[PDB]
Amino acid sequence: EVQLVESGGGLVKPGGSLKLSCAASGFTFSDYYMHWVRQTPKKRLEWVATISDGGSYTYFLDSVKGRFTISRDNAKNKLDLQMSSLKSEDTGMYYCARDGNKYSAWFAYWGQGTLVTVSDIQMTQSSSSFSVSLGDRVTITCKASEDIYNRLAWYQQKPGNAPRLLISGATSLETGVPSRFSGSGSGKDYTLSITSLQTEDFATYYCQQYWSPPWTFGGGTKLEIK
Amino acid sequence: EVQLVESGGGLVKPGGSLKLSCAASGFTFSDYYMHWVRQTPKKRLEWVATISDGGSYTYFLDSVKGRFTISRDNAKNKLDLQMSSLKSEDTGMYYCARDGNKYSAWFAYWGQGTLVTVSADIQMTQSSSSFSVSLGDRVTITCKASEDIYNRLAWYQQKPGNAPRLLISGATSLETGVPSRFSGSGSGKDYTLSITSLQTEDFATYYCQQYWSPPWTFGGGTKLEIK
Amino acid sequence: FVNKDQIAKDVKQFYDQALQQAVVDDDANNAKAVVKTFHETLDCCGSSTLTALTTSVLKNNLCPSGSNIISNLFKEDCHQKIDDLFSGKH
Amino acid sequence: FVNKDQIAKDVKQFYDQALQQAVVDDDANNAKAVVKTFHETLDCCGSSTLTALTTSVLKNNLCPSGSNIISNLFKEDCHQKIDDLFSGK
């Protein structure tokens, strides 16, 4: 029943400005920290900004700091990202995301995204892709540059659609996530295992750490049929 | 102005029943524990009952326990003492009193009283029953405790016809509107009430009361008489 | 949104409530546990509002440790310790 | 009258508020004092709701002692210790 609708794109000049807005519905907006996560054209996921539940507290990605501003209207159930002094690096789909809890930096719900076109813990996903057939079994690996104390999330992303949260806290499956998905690991080494591969399972899989900011993502592991 | 008006008192037969009621005004009734204190025909002061601010908690004098019930109506700003199985010992003036704080057992304000006449422990020792003193003189009334009180001692002045009035609390602290000529000192078991430059309004009976361990016992009193 | 003064006020009231309940009956052992927890945690004893309970509090073994007899007087310090918790002292 | 669940809820919120404020450097040395007082008094560290702050709370010297790293996880226990205060554990 949760819904996030982002407006504000698209085409802009280098040095230009844009005002992205997110329209939340289906939950208590005032109880959650809200974030902005962007997907590059090379499909790399990157967290950009956070606004506290009340609005008084603000966090930014170092590269967007001093150019990007966050705001929220708890009465109007809306969140805004004011982008200025835009560079080429800023191009991508901008997703509005609600925090898993009040402020654990994992993204339980995302919006469809708004395209913005303009003209640190390392999360290592060994394999960019895996060619597997239906009914098969896969293990996607995720390595951290330092011990991330099981503070790890897994996202599934089909094309056209936004990323969907599968697992939080390295092991805990989300509601409506099938038994065939499993997450294990500790310290730096983590895995996402999918057994009895079904058709809906072919997608790009990302791991994300939420131990120390910036909340870094892995490159992804795209599961392709063959 | 804090006001307490008690009603209900009357002539009663032994074993009889009476329903005393106190009508409070001038303060936040809901914030204070309320009590019932009675004065015997031989003028001895005696605490009888306590009702908590909310009304859920109740305390009684052993001799009235199971024969007396306390209740309160915070909406109607009223407090009631339901007396049943009446004995001779219960005869006396019944004063309704508001606690000094939420629940410190000293009596900052008292009502005029209702007479209850029935037809036919820390010992607080006040050395002298009376003192014959002239105007302008100086007096020291002494109060001795059977046990350490920890300065948790009050002093009351009572002129005849009128209810007791609180002079000092915490052995030393004078109440507002109490003149500088009144002073209280002492510690542990031995306490004193000293009055300098005796004026005419000063001739009355003086009582000490301990509020350390229940029952909150009073002294016999020390009546100051002119000579 | 939650303000400092109202919270201490509420924590102090909750303490008083637990204290009154703890001394009235032996079979209100939850209230006795809460009171023991507060006294042990805050290194305190007694209510500054409900001072009359002190003797009963002591007799019910609710203050095994901590000196509260400062001079010839017993000071109820829980309301203060609660204030210090929300102030950032003690 | 005061209800155990609501007062625990309120104390936990007040703690979160102090934690968030203490983590950003300024005149918010009062918030740093409150957090230090809570951690020292309740023998805890961190918020179970505001878990993301943990690294910043550690880096701001708000948890010098006390083992919070159990098995292979750091568990933020202040919200539990607050519950235990009002429960009598």
Side-chain angles (χ1 to χ4, degrees):
Chain A
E1 281 82 276
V2 188
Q3 251 192 278
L4 302 168
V5 171
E6 49 277 49
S7 350
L11 190 54
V12 56
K13 7 264 161 175
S17 299
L18 265 192
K19 199 264 223 172
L20 314 181
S21 207
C22 170
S25 46
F27 66 102
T28 326
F29 189 62
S30 331
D31 294 356
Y32 292 91
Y33 275 47
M34 294 292 300
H35 322 268
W36 284 96
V37 183
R38 64 177 189 203
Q39 197 166 32
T40 82
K42 306 258 93 64
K43 297 217 133 225
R44 204 103 199 187
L45 276 168
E46 183 173 28
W47 160 81
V48 294
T50 303
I51 187 102
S52 72
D53 58 321
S56 10
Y57 303 87
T58 242
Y59 290 96
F60 288 95
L61 169 59
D62 275 342
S63 75
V64 305
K65 187 103 191 276
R67 299 168 6 201
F68 284 30
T69 34
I70 299 290
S71 72
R72 71 143 99 205
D73 203 307
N74 295 136
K76 270 191 84 185
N77 289 309
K78 66 174 272 166
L79 146 96
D80 302 73
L81 173 69
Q82 307 101 61
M83 311 186 292
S84 253
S85 186
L86 298 152
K87 305 184 161 203
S88 70
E89 53 154 274
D90 295 336
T91 305
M93 189 74 66
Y94 280 63
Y95 302 99
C96 152
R98 187 212 88 173
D99 199 290
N101 302 307
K102 182 109 86 178
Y103 185 45
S104 304
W106 50 275
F107 324 109
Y109 301 96
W110 307 56
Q112 85 291 323
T114 15
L115 189 66
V116 169
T117 155
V118 49
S119 180
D120 272 31
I121 308 179
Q122 287 101 207
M123 292 294 110
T124 299
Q125 270 176 268
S126 164
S127 33
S128 54
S129 67
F130 271 129
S131 227
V132 278
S133 53
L134 279 157
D136 279 8
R137 121 202 311 122
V138 256
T139 149
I140 298 145
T141 204
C142 177
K143 249 93 95 73
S145 75
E146 76 142 272
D147 184 342
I148 59 136
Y149 305 93
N150 280 240
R151 277 143 119 107
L152 180 108
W154 289 105
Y155 302 93
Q156 178 195 65
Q157 187 191 36
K158 279 125 149 161
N161 297 264
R164 175 197 165 209
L165 171 77
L166 299 179
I167 301 146
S168 65
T171 67
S172 318
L173 291 156
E174 281 298 299
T175 57
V177 184
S179 33
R180 79 186 172 276
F181 285 86
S182 130
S184 67
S186 278
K188 304 181 177 181
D189 318 310
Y190 297 92
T191 59
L192 172 71
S193 302
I194 312 154
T195 199
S196 291
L197 278 163
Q198 289 186 23
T199 191
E200 48 270 49
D201 303 341
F202 293 89
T204 316
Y205 293 85
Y206 299 92
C207 63
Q208 173 237 327
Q209 63 86 19
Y210 50 88
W211 168 246
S212 187
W215 327 111
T216 51
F217 284 82
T221 303
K222 182 188 184 169
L223 280 177
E224 293 180 286
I225 183 86
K226 248 289 102 259
Chain B
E1 186 195 72
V2 169
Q3 253 160 81
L4 302 169
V5 171
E6 46 280 65
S7 48
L11 258 299
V12 81
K13 68 194 305 190
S17 299
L18 267 191
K19 199 263 224 171
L20 314 181
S21 209
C22 170
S25 66
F27 66 101
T28 301
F29 190 61
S30 331
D31 293 1
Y32 292 91
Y33 275 46
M34 295 291 301
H35 322 268
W36 284 96
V37 197
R38 63 178 189 201
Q39 198 166 33
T40 91
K42 281 179 180 183
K43 296 214 281 174
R44 206 181 85 238
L45 276 168
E46 183 174 27
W47 161 81
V48 295
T50 303
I51 187 103
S52 73
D53 58 319
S56 25
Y57 302 85
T58 243
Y59 289 96
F60 288 95
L61 170 58
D62 275 342
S63 75
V64 305
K65 187 103 191 271
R67 321 155 39 220
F68 283 30
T69 33
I70 204 171
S71 72
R72 69 144 101 203
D73 203 308
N74 295 138
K76 270 191 83 186
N77 289 308
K78 65 175 270 167
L79 148 92
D80 302 74
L81 173 68
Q82 307 100 61
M83 310 187 292
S84 60
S85 281
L86 291 159
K87 307 181 161 157
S88 296
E89 54 154 274
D90 313 312
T91 303
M93 188 75 66
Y94 279 64
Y95 303 98
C96 153
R98 187 211 89 173
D99 199 280
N101 302 329
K102 182 107 86 178
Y103 185 45
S104 302
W106 50 277
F107 324 109
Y109 301 95
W110 307 56
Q112 85 291 323
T114 15
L115 190 65
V116 170
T117 153
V118 51
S119 55
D121 274 30
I122 309 175
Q123 337 285 156
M124 293 294 110
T125 300
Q126 269 177 266
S127 167
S128 46
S129 334
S130 68
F131 270 130
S132 231
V133 247
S134 52
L135 278 156
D137 279 7
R138 124 170 75 234
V139 255
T140 298
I141 298 144
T142 203
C143 176
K144 249 92 96 71
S146 75
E147 197 179 328
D148 213 283
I149 268 180
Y150 303 92
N151 281 46
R152 286 151 97 109
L153 179 108
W155 288 105
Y156 302 93
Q157 179 194 64
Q158 188 192 35
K159 279 125 148 162
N162 308 268
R165 175 197 165 209
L166 172 75
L167 298 180
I168 292 156
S169 64
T172 67
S173 317
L174 291 156
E175 281 298 299
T176 59
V178 183
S180 304
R181 79 186 172 276
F182 285 87
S183 130
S185 66
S187 79
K189 304 181 176 181
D190 319 309
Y191 296 92
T192 59
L193 172 71
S194 302
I195 313 154
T196 328
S197 287
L198 277 163
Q199 288 186 24
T200 191
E201 48 271 48
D202 302 341
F203 293 89
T205 316
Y206 293 86
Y207 299 92
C208 62
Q209 173 236 327
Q210 62 87 18
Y211 49 87
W212 192 58
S213 187
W216 327 110
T217 50
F218 284 82
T222 304
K223 183 188 183 191
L224 273 26
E225 276 152 351
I226 183 85
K227 57 188 173 193
Chain C
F1 54 90
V2 142
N3 149 78
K4 188 249 173 173
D5 306 295
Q6 199 41 268
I7 310 324
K9 180 173 163 258
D10 291 354
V11 174
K12 277 137 99 185
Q13 199 190 322
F14 178 92
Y15 170 76
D16 294 349
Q17 281 165 207
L19 202 76
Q20 177 58 103
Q21 200 191 124
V23 291
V24 80
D25 192 14
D26 277 64
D27 283 280
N29 295 287
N30 166 63
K32 277 182 166 74
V34 171
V35 167
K36 282 193 271 178
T37 294
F38 269 75
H39 293 167
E40 201 175 331
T41 307
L42 308 176
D43 189 29
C44 72
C45 180
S47 164
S48 302
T49 49
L50 267 59
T51 64
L53 304 179
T54 298
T55 269
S56 186
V57 172
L58 297 188
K59 277 174 187 159
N60 278 268
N61 288 294
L62 306 178
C63 305
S65 60
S67 188
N68 290 91
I69 306 155
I70 277 84
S71 47
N72 290 292
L73 295 96
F74 187 112
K75 61 109 200 193
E76 288 80 10
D77 59 342
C78 294
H79 290 184
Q80 193 53 64
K81 301 300 195 101
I82 284 159
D83 272 359
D84 300 347
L85 179 57
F86 294 95
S87 304
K89 285 120 192 70
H90 91 298
Chain D
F1 189 87
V2 161
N3 146 67
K4 188 249 172 174
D5 305 295
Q6 199 39 62
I7 189 56
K9 180 172 162 260
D10 291 353
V11 173
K12 275 138 98 185
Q13 199 192 320
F14 178 88
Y15 170 77
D16 294 335
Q17 281 165 208
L19 201 75
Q20 177 59 103
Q21 199 192 125
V23 131
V24 306
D25 312 303
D26 63 295
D27 59 270
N29 293 288
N30 166 62
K32 276 182 167 73
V34 171
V35 167
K36 282 192 271 179
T37 294
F38 269 76
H39 290 197
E40 199 177 324
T41 307
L42 310 174
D43 184 48
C44 70
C45 178
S47 164
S48 300
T49 48
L50 267 58
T51 63
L53 303 179
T54 300
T55 49
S56 186
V57 355
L58 296 190
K59 278 175 185 160
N60 277 270
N61 289 295
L62 307 177
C63 307
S65 59
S67 195
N68 276 79
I69 307 152
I70 54 154
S71 84
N72 292 293
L73 293 96
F74 180 118
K75 237 193 163 173
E76 23 276 299
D77 54 6
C78 292
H79 290 194
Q80 193 53 66
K81 300 301 202 288
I82 284 158
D83 272 26
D84 301 346
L85 179 57
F86 294 94
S87 304
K89 284 120 193 70

